[PDB]
Design a protein around this ligand. Sequence first.
Ligand SMILES: Nc1nc2c(ncn2[C@@H]2O[C@H](COP(=O)(O)OP(=O)(O)O)[C@@H](O)[C@H]2O)c(=O)[nH]1
Ligand SMILES: *C(=O)[C@@H](N)Cc1ccccc1
Lengths: 82, 85, 61, 205, 375
Amino acid sequence: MVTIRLARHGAKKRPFYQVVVADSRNARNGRFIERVGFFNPIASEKEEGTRLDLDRIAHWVGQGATISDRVAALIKEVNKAA
Amino acid sequence: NIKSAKKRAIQSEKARKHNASRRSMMRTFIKKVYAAIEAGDKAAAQKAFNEMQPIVDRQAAKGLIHKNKAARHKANLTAQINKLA
Amino acid sequence: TSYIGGEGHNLQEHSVILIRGGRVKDLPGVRYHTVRGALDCSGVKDRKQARSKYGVKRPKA
Amino acid sequence: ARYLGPKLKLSRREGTDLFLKSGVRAIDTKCKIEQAPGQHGARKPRLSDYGVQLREKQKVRRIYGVLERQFRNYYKEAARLKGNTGENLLALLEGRLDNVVYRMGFGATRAEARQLVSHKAIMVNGRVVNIASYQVSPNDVVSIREKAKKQSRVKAALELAEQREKPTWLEVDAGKMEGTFKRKPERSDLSADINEHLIVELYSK
Amino acid sequence: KPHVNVGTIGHVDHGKTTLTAAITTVLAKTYGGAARAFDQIDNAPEEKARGITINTSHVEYDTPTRHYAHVDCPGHADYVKNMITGAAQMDGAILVVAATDGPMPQTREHILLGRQVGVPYIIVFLNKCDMVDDEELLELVEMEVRELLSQYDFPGDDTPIVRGSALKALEGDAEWEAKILELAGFLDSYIPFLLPIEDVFSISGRGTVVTGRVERGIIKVGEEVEIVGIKETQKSTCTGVEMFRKLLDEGRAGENVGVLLRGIKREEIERGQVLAKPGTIKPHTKFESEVYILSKDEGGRHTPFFKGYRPQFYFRTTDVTGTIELPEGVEMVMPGDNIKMVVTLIHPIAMDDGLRFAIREGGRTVGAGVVAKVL
RNA sequence: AAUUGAAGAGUUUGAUCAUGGCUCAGAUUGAACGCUGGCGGCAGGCCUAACACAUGCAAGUCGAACGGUAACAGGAAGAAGCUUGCUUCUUUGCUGACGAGUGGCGGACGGGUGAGUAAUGUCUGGGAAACUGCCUGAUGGAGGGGGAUAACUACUGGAAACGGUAGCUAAUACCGCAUAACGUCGCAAGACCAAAGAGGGGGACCUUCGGGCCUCUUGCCAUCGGAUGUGCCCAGAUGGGAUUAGCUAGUAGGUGGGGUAACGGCUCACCUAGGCGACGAUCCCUAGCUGGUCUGAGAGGAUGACCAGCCACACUGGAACUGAGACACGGUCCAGACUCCUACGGGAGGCAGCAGUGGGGAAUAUUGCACAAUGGGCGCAAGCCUGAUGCAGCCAUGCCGCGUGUAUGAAGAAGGCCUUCGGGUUGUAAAGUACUUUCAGCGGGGAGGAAGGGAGUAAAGUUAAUACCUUUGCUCAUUGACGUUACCCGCAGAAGAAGCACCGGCUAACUCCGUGCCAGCAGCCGCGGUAAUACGGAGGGUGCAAGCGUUAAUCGGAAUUACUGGG
RNA sequence: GCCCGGAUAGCUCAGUCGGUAGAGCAGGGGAUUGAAAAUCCCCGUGUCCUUGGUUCGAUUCCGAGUCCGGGCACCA
Ligand SMILES: Nc1nc2c(ncn2[C@@H]2O[C@H](COP(=O)(O)OP(=O)(O)O)[C@@H](O)[C@H]2O)c(=O)[nH]1
Ligand SMILES: *C(=O)[C@@H](N)Cc1ccccc1
């Protein structure tokens, strides 16, 4: 099973989630096939904080890979249409 | 050990007594074919073949064999009787 | 065998101590220093300068 | 962090008015300058090469009020920049907030200027900055927070800047006690007597 | 809250336990607090202190100004192993004297045992005043106690004696109920967590558990407590308290508890030291002590001592011997003096003013002392 | 924008140039110790005993798989108090849910240690003789029967552990039949092989009145795929010793049989007699490997803590089953060692999981909080479990930031110290005086980490249907361990916060007195023999800073292993 | 917690079954020399660990504690 989950990085009280394509039978920050963008939930009023290249994502889900609910909800936030 | 996953202990013993009993009958059907090949009776083994050909193939779909091991059996066993006939 | 430094010590046949290396090039064979102020070896008396070595505490008064 | 000791004695170590005690009385004259480093200060120092190289470095540290590890951290910054190491150090050291406010004239002495910065009185970009080691970026404006504005200290200090230099790599308003930092300084316009050439090879070893 | 240990002494069956059941109830209703039943005080659970089986009930009564932890023994021999060995000590005792029996020989032994261990104050409670209701016989019982105190070196000429009836204070009759308040009032007028080290136990798997009954204050599981020992003092915390292998969330005043430390060996703590409050007392290498010397017929000595004489001081749980310096003016100190002596003990420990002890030397109790001045 | 970068000095000698070792100045450390000590931010903290271990907890879950319901809460029938429906309350699986049992799934993940391993491993680059649950793509099927077993009862052995005897019933449990395909065995013809039903809603119809029937969601069987994982093979590379020189006889290859998912000496029978070996076999010693870390101008040298991938191990040794996957940390069987219970016949147990204890050792932390978040497990979901993880506690262990205040202040004091006793120095230092206040401490406000989920409603699809279900918005109440948070404001007062090494040269910075080859100093050269800038105290100065020194360790300097770069 | 052995001038030991403490190795003080070797001339420098008892009198007798090493427990 291949998933599109996250990866807790950063520090104590200062997270930085790496939206990553990995396997479900491994560690959170373990073996991953690729990191498709990143996510900053502790962001500011700057010009960034979320990057997700849809093409790489769709190529994985189209194969049979599952997506994490957190990422999918944020995918509705990244709005593929608008 | 003190763990509710000790049912897998009694599950396996129920399964090993079951599975091996099936494997023993699976093997003896193979042995029966070798008796005729030893005596050289091309007619007996042919019948003995189709006697349990479905049997060894039956454990394949059951999940007992890796299905390729079972297929390998039907290949060489035929090779012996065609060598004889 | 180690070198017991200090002005008047209190080591008698036993009492566990600590050994730190370092030759003195004054005695044939020795290669260590018994640390003053460790486990049983008390601090040397009347020493007001350089007390990190010799294990003397800071004078209370 | 700080030295907090007789901060005029070390000026006698080198025999130069390092502005450590500007205050309100401009000219001191009663400190026995140039002839009171220690007790037997009448003797002439042997002054070896390692000694002349050290004093050059030791002069500036007592001037900005930083320490060795702080300085070695600063020098390492100068190594990883193009152009020239000699100027990379001095351009960096002017980036100190307590130096900037001192150069603006809002601080009599750097020691006094360091205190207003550390006590949230200073405000850059409308933001309160506590750490004096704040490397100010070019083209930025600083100001004094309103509650801590004109609390008698900056008032006396502002007029004392009228016996000063009034540099060119920065700009002041002095109408609402506002100062704006321009581009980073060049060597040619900073005191003209502090040699950075001797500093560089000391940290090579 | 300041705390003083108190106990009821005297002849058995005079009214000690019911008086103990009288003060615990009178201070719990009119002032507030928890009350202990009489049968709960009459029956005492067992405890093993220094290897001796001791049955002592630990009840408590609270006064608006003072905190009290009471001890009791339904057997005279149990009272014997209390004060001398170092189990139970009171700064002020409540001498229970029945008006129908007066000063009994057993009452005379409790007056005697107060001398040796060093009990400075003794409040007297004349009990059984509900039988002898005449003025003449009630004052003959008063002078016999006072003569038994004055002969035994006690300030019997100015001690407040409370005439009362203990059993009448149980049902709640106001006439004798308020008199116990006069008794409780006399406990305050006339008469800081600290813990002695009676025995240590390296509980297998848990760590080092020090045993000892609570001297003063209340402690819970988790407080940072310091320990003053005959070494350089250290800091730790009480990660647990159990009593006879029975869980206990709080270690209160009077209860024989078991404190569990935070990372300490058996060699770090030796029996005799003390766990005190982090910030009250520091150890001293020098101090002054006031002592009273017995005579040859009550133990003591028969030959005097000189300079350099080092007797074994027994302060609550410690057998520390110390070379004693004598005051100027005296050379030979004969058995029977009441002079002060200078102490330079071999190993520093928390020695504040007021600490009582019974001096020994060779194997017999020589005298009773109290720290006069800390140096 | 992407390595702008390399130092020396002391000591052979009467003196000198070389050769040549020894040593020191630097950086660093998973650190330890000594002294001292104000706080905070982020990491890190058992390297020796892979030493033995008390207790708590660390993997369970699903009623939408099934018989049941021992318990808790309702419904319903009934029954008793007596206020006649206010209560009391015996039956009852009829619902919600649920101990224990059968079953599917997980338990092979996650987490810890480094004993073993010198090549069966790892790293690098290729390869074909394979397999691959969960997830996903495409195409068909999913028809029909039978008999046991646990729970549950009766009886019964045993201290317990732990079973036994005669019977009961069902199922997505199990076993046959039917039907086969581009699937499998075969040159072909032919032969042979699969399975399982549940949940919600409801119209006509239909009700042996259980339910069928239509439909929605999901699961089951087979095949070729795909993604992913896993296994196997070759080549290169991956420590030291030749005072280790011959090693090997299932060993080198072949044929055949058998076995393995798959090729194979993987294993056997027979034939042949070869195979490895100086560009190092075997043997012995040591040892987890790499991406990296430290030093170094580089090349290289040393090293492999934390993190990440991999292999190995799970008290010792061995074996095997189950299963997609283990030949398995919290699984089984056996031998052995060490503990534990014992009713002495017999059984029970493995902290190198997080804490913790004994002991070891120079030395390395709480038997904490919560599942809010991320991930994982099961489940339709809700949820439940989660010592993974997220946090808190402990320590100056490291990197980093900040404070211990500022300005003013000359009889240029007292006192200390030196003095040619004039004075100088301590010293703008302090006192005195005028202001401000980070962080401590006290008292109130207050981010953000929170995405969703649950219920409701409208719309759009699904359908016979406005239902059910699914999806896109929206409304209500909201879910936060940390947490007396980050941050902000107010109040009082300089109030609560500075030691450590050193001062002959190398190497930055001095005298006096005391001790007199004594005591001690010491890295090296070297000090001390009665006037010591080197011993000890004291004043002063210097270096650094909440750290300063010391020892050990590694590299550098060492071009004293020299390929760059020597003789 | 309890039971013994060492605690004898710098060091190692004799002496006791009460009678005013020894020896050996020492080391040092003086004369010589620039300072010592060598030679000559003189040597206890002791609280018998401390303390108390049985006292004409205790190192030695009975007692205790403390320090050190060696054996046994006990497990809030
Ligand atoms: N007459 C009378 N008897 C009393 C009084 N106080 C106590 N007692 C009696 O003393 C007896 C025991 O008293 P207590 O102190 O419990 O004795 P203990 O527990 O055995 O030492 C009881 O039986 C009471 O009757 C009193 O005031 N008057
Ligand atoms: C442990 O039980 C202590 N709280 C009390 C105790 C009992 C027996 C012996 C020693 C202490």
